[PDB]
Amino acid sequence: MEIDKELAPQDRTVTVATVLPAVPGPSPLTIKQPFQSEVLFAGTKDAEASLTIANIDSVSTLTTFYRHASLESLWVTIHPTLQAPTFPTTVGVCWVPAQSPVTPAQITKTYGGQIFCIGGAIQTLSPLIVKCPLEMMQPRVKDSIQYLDSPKLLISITAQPTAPPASTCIITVSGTLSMHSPLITDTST
Amino acid sequence: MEIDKELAPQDRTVTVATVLPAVPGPSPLTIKQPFQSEVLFAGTKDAEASLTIANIDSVSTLTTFYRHASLESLWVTIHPTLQAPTFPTTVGVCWVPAQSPVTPAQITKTYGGQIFCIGGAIQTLSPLIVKCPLEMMQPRVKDSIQYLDSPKLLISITAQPTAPPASTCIITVSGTLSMHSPLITDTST
Amino acid sequence: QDRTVTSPLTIKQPFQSEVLFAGTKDAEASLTIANIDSVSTLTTFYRHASLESLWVTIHPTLQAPTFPTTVGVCWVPAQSPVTPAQITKTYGGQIFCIGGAIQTLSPLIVKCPLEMMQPRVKDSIQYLDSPKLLISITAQPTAPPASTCIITVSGTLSMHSPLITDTST
Amino acid sequence: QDRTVTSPLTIKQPFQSEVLFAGTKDAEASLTIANIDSVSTLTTFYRHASLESLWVTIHPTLQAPTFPTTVGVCWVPAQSPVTPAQITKTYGGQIFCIGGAIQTLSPLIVKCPLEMMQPRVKDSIQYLDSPKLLISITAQPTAPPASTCIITVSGTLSMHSPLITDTST
Amino acid sequence: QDRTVTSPLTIKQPFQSEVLFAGTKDAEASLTIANIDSVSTLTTFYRHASLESLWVTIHPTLQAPTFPTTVGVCWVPAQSPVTPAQITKTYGGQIFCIGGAIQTLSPLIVKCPLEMMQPRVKDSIQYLDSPKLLISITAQPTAPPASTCIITVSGTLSMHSPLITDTST
Amino acid sequence: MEIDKELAPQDRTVTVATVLPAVPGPSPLTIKQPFQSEVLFAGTKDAEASLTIANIDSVSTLTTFYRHASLESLWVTIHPTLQAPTFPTTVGVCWVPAQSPVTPAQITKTYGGQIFCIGGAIQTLSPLIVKCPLEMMQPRVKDSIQYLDSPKLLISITAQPTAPPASTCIITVSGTLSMHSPLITDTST
């Protein structure tokens, strides 16, 4: 009984982030909200992607009525589709604090930066999963101020020269949120 | 000796569900009924499916003679057929409360939802299994009231561009019901 | 009349309501005693109501003797697929010959197996397995002047927790 | 209705099935309730099934009054040599006059003496002394329009141990 | 059905035997159930036989409705001077109107007061106070096609101590 | 050091069988006899198979001189031949009590029912083994009476559209018997 997911863990390093602590007072309640959003749909045309988890519409939508929200768990998944087999394609993944000057074309020049060969060869199909190291990141996704070391995702796709009819893989980002403190706004809608 | 069945477990989250409390009286007789019913037969044409485990034949018929039925174990499984090798196929799966407004066309936008690449000689063919987290669903598949958190199954299937002669895999749902309190009905058939 | 096992101040209100007048024309009837006049008006001032006793009865009448009439009843959980055209196929099955001509006798009774279906006829939620009655009259081929019998439903309700409605009328 | 002495999760399913429609033509019937529709479909998903209660009933109907009809029943161990043409010769013997014309009344019942025959209607082995019913209709010399009565078999089953069959339909 | 007080392996065999077929001609019958077919054949292989239960029954039939028929029964100690022409004069007295026309219903039963007469129907000695039945049919003045009813005797025997006879047939 | 056999265990459920116990007396001696019989030789033409282990000639032949015999261990094996590689084929297996109304075309509609893709893709070659659950069956293969819940095997083969030159796999049934009590018959032969 083996698990259908496959892991390619990103190299780590000790890096604490500055974070504002709530004013002395009565602890407020708190819920947690899970989420999975689409990031990319590559395979056909060479394309890169560099998004800041802090602003994914999914997150945007959930934290809507709370003034405080942090990232419990976060991570990217690469799901090879029915094209991945016939169209091996290169994929680059790298979690970097939104406050880092790197671009997707520098994945392999950045410490964590990884390169994958989604599809083609033997065993090149189980969905990949790269857990974002909030340990190194700045998990504060919504606060009293706007932080900078917030989690940012990088992606680089090197499509086949003779492109596949359709996308070879779907790239989603998932995680769980932990938010609290109501934002006294208009709830009319 | 390894097991010919690989499982891809859906990520969960703490989510309770209320449920009609036991009516005053003495414990009642009860039975458990296992079951497996075909939900899909694809690989040949793009097609999605969104059925409520609460109403699938095997269940639909087993509960017919009781006023109450609860799911002991429940899970969906994909069996690649002899076409699976020649025709890699994308299959998406997601368990959500029958009360979730989610459509299979948006599985990858729903927390749990996952998508697999069943097929392609370049890799494994063991039956994939996605056990429905009843911890999250509303296990009461049949009762005195009409709960709505009841388990619902989402499937999405993108077939090969140049479809295979026949289906590349059979998608079935298995489980065990715990029923009791006979429902007066016509047993003629 | 069969078998098969498996703090708030409350009151008990007995009742009987005419459910069907027949014998003059073949006819099926599938009513859920959970909504019959009496019950309706009785539970009107409460939020919780359950059946203590429940049963159907057919009062043979004057015509009964001059016009034999087949009549069937069958108690069933409102959440059940059975239809009147199939009573003797059901467990609560039961058929009669009301006014088996020159017959006479008190009205036939048919205790509803409540220990076999949600007897809460009124609550905070909407139940399904509530008691539902199935009638099946098949009048004489040559219709009678009036009805050969009166089918009524009698029972007792256990209610409590006042419902803040208008008590005008 | 007579006398003469001598761990696995189970459920209880009640039932009633029309065994015979008669009154229009003399006829004998010798069925083994161990195989009647209801029972058949009910035990379908188990490997062990036994009878909790069992009895036959005759529902006099509309014609009953206009066409007296002799009808006989007799419960007997399926592994018994008796035939319908000889009911009153048997202990379970019992005869009626269904629709004794202008009669009427609920249907006649005849409890089967289960404590007198293997009530296991389904098992790992094939039993013989299982319950078998004997019917014996002798219609009016001048046939009636329709049947004078409906003979049904009602009972409760005690089952358990799922049988791995197809639950498609 | 009345009142008035005052080691060896055994088995119990139940039974029913047709004692009389009538309704077509006035007739008296005075048989001692101690010697009826069933009993006869049953006690055949024992030396000691006693009655556990015993009673007479009349199965109204098809003709019953078209031909009312007076019929009388009376259980009496075989060693008793009473005759059928005098049943209502006896304590076990009992009369009916089998096929009281347009009547119908199960067969009439008449429990024999065994705690009132030697129930040993077979023994080492010849008893006298054994159970004896008295029947008294008085058919319609205008005879019916067939018999209006069947009079049978049912009971249970308690036997023991094998009788060394031929078990060929 | 991995084992060349591969296992695909059939879903179980609690189901006891009625079984006659020997009359009070002196326990008799008992031997055990192993056995492997051919069941099917598919791959070339679509074909099904539904046999009752209780009457396999192999069993028939062994229990020949004993009036009592039960199934110690029982199971099916699918051995892909030199054709399995080039001719992926579908196989359905399901153990069901001889007293169950199911047919091989209903494998996937029966609780245990499994579907395999013998050959073609990667790792689709090690011999499969489906152990019959005597736990659920009626192990009594030869007794004082004839039982019904005896073990029965179901098989369904979906051969390649363009059939292989020869069979793609050999299907055998194996097990060990446990018998005792001599059947006083004529041993002339």
| SS (HEC) of chain F | CCCCCEECCCCCCCCCCCCCCCCCCCCCCCEEEEEEEEEECCCCCCEEEEECHHHCHHHHHHHHHEEEEEEEEEEEEEEECCCCCCCCEEEEEEEEECCCCCCHHHHHHECCCEEEEECCCCCCCCCEEEECCCCCCCCEEECCCCCCCCEEEEEEEECCCCCCCCCCEEEEEEEEEEEEEECCCCCCC
What is the rounded distance in angstroms from the CA atom of residue E6 to the CA atom of residue E115? 8
What is the rounded distance in angstroms from the CA atom of residue D37 to the CA atom of residue D33? 9
Say if strands B151-158 and B47-52 run parallel, antiparallel, or are unpaired.
antiparallel
For A85, nearest residue in chain B (alpha carbons):
B120
Strand order in the sheet with D131-138: D27-31, D131-138, D70-77, D95-96
Which long-range contacts (C-beta less than 8 Å, at least 24 apart) are formed by A26-30?
Answer: A28/A180, A28/A181, A29/A180, A30/A178, A30/A179, A30/A180
Q: Do B30 and D11 touch (CB under 8 A)?
A: yes
Two tokens, residue A27: 């602890």
Two tokens, residue F99: 């007293």
Angle value at C-alpha A16, between A12 and A22, nearest 5 degrees = 140
Q: Are residues A53 and A36 in contact, defined by beta-carbon separation less than 8 angstroms?
A: no
**Start-to-end Cα distance in chain C:** 38
Q: Which H or E run includes C149?
A: strand C149-162
Query: DSSP assignment, residue E107?
Result: P
What is the rounded distance in angstroms from the CA atom of residue C137 to the CA atom of residue B116? 59
Amino acid at E84: P
DSSP chain A: --BS-EE-PPP--------PPPPSSPPPP-EEEEEEEEEE--SSS-EEEEE-GGG-HHHHHHGGGEEEEEEEEEEEEEEE-TTTTTS-EEEEEEEEETT----GGGGGGSSS-EEEEESSSTT--SPEEEE--TTTS--EEE-SS--SS-EEEEEEEE--TT--SS-SEEEEEEEEEEEEEE-------
For C57, nearest residue in chain D (alpha carbons):
D106
Query: DSSP assignment, residue B139?
Result: -
Chains F+E touching (3+ CB pairs under 8 Å): no
3-class DSSP state for residue E159?
strand
Rounded alpha-carbon distances, angstroms, from residue E18 to D1, E39, F98: 20, 12, 47
Chain A adjacent subunits, 3+ CB pairs under 8 A: B
Q: Are residues A142 and A68 in contact, defined by beta-carbon separation less than 8 angstroms?
A: yes
Q: Which of D144, D147, D63, D146 is nearest to D100 (CA)?
A: D63
DSSP D102-164: S---SPEEEE---TTS--EEE-SS--SS-EEEEEEEE--SS--SS-SEEEEEEEEEEEEEE--
Instruction: Please give the backbone phi and psi of residue E132, each rounded to the nearest 5 degrees, phi first.
Output: -130, 130
| SS (HEC) of B31-91 | EEEEEEEEEEEECCCCEEEEEEHHHCHHHHHHHHHEEEEEEEEEEEEEEECCCCCCCCEEE
Amino acid at B11: D
Q: Do B79 and F116 touch (CB under 8 A)?
A: yes
Two tokens, residue C169: 């009328």
Say if strands A128-131 and A6-7 run parallel, antiparallel, or are unpaired.
parallel
Q: Which H or E run includes B95?
A: strand B89-97
Two tokens, residue B109: 């936008």
Buried b / exposed e over D30-43, threshold 16 CB at 10 Å, is: bbbbbebbbbbbbb
Two tokens, residue D35: 């195989």
Q: Find where tokens 């909504």 sit.
A: C35
Q: Which of A33, A74, A38 is nearest to A54 (CA)?
A: A74
No. of helices (H) and no. of strands (E), chain C: 1, 9
Radius of gyration, CA atoms only, chain B: 18
Q: Which of E48, E4, E49, E22 is nearest to E137 (CA)?
A: E22
In terms of C-beta density within 10 A (0-12 exposed, 13-18 middle, 19 or more buried), how is residue C107 classed?
Answer: middle
Query: DSSP assignment, residue C133?
Result: E
* Residue numbers preceding breaks in chain E (C to N > 2.5 A): 6
Query: DSSP assignment, residue C106?
Result: S
**Start-to-end Cα distance in chain D:** 38
Given phi > 0 = left and psi -120 to 50 = alpha, else beta, which region is F117? beta
> For residue D129, what are the contacts with CB-CB under 8 A and spacing of at least 6?
D77, D78, D79, D117, D118
> For residue D79, what are the contacts with CB-CB under 8 A and spacing of at least 6?
D128, D129, D130
What is the rounded distance in angstroms from the CA atom of residue C52 to the CA atom of residue C39? 12
Please tell me the distance in Å from F174's CA to the nearest CA on chain B.
18
Q: Do F115 and B34 touch (CB under 8 A)?
A: no
Q: Are residues F57 and F113 in contact, defined by beta-carbon separation less than 8 angstroms?
A: no
Within its chain, how far is the Cα of F173 from the centroid?
4
Please tell me the distance in Å from B109's CA to the nearest CA on chain F.
31
Instruction: Please give the backbone phi and psi of residue D85, each rounded to the nearest 5 degrees, phi first.
Output: -60, 0
Q: Are residues E84 and E19 in contact, defined by beta-carbon separation less than 8 angstroms?
A: no
What is the rounded distance in angstroms from the CA atom of residue D40 to the CA atom of residue C14? 41
Chain B adjacent subunits, 3+ CB pairs under 8 A: A, C, D, F
Instruction: Please give the backbone phi and psi of residue A62, each rounded to the nearest 5 degrees, phi first.
Output: -75, -55
Q: Are residues E148 and E98 in contact, defined by beta-carbon separation less than 8 angstroms?
A: yes
Please tell me the distance in Å from C116's CA to the nearest CA on chain B.
7
Two tokens, residue E47: 């030396």
Q: Is the dihedral of CA E25, E30, E33, E36 positive or negative?
A: negative
DSSP bridge partners of A50: A154
Domain locations in chain E as residue ranges: 1-169
Q: What's the CATH code, domain D1-169?
A: 2.60.120.20
> For residue F99, what are the contacts with CB-CB under 8 A and spacing of at least 6?
D47, D124, D163, F138, F148, F149, F150
Q: Which of A108, A79, A73 is nearest to A94 (CA)?
A: A108
Q: Is the dihedral of CA E15, E18, E20, E22 positive or negative?
A: positive
The domain F1-189 having CATH identifier 3.60.15.10: the answer here is no
DSSP bridge partners of F116: F91
What is the rounded distance in angstroms from the CA atom of residue D21 to the CA atom of residue D28? 12
Q: Resolution in A, one decimal?
A: 3.8
DSSP bridge partners of F49: F155
Question: B19 in contact with C at a CB cutoff of 8 Å?
Answer: no
D-interface mutation test, from B63, B187, B189, most D Cβ less than 10 A away: B187
Q: Do D154 and C5 touch (CB under 8 A)?
A: no
Q: Which of A95, A105, A82, A85 is nearest to A158 (CA)?
A: A105
What is the rounded distance in angstroms from the CA atom of residue F90 to the CA atom of residue D124? 33
Question: E61 in contact with D at a CB cutoff of 8 Å?
Answer: yes
Q: Find where tokens 């399913």 sit.
A: D13
Instruction: Please give the backbone phi and psi of residue C34, each rounded to the nearest 5 degrees, phi first.
Output: -65, -20
Q: Do D91 and E154 touch (CB under 8 A)?
A: yes
Q: Which H or E run includes D47?
A: strand D46-60
What is the rounded distance in angstroms from the CA atom of residue F189 to the CA atom of residue F187? 5
Q: Find where tokens 């407004």 sit.
A: B101
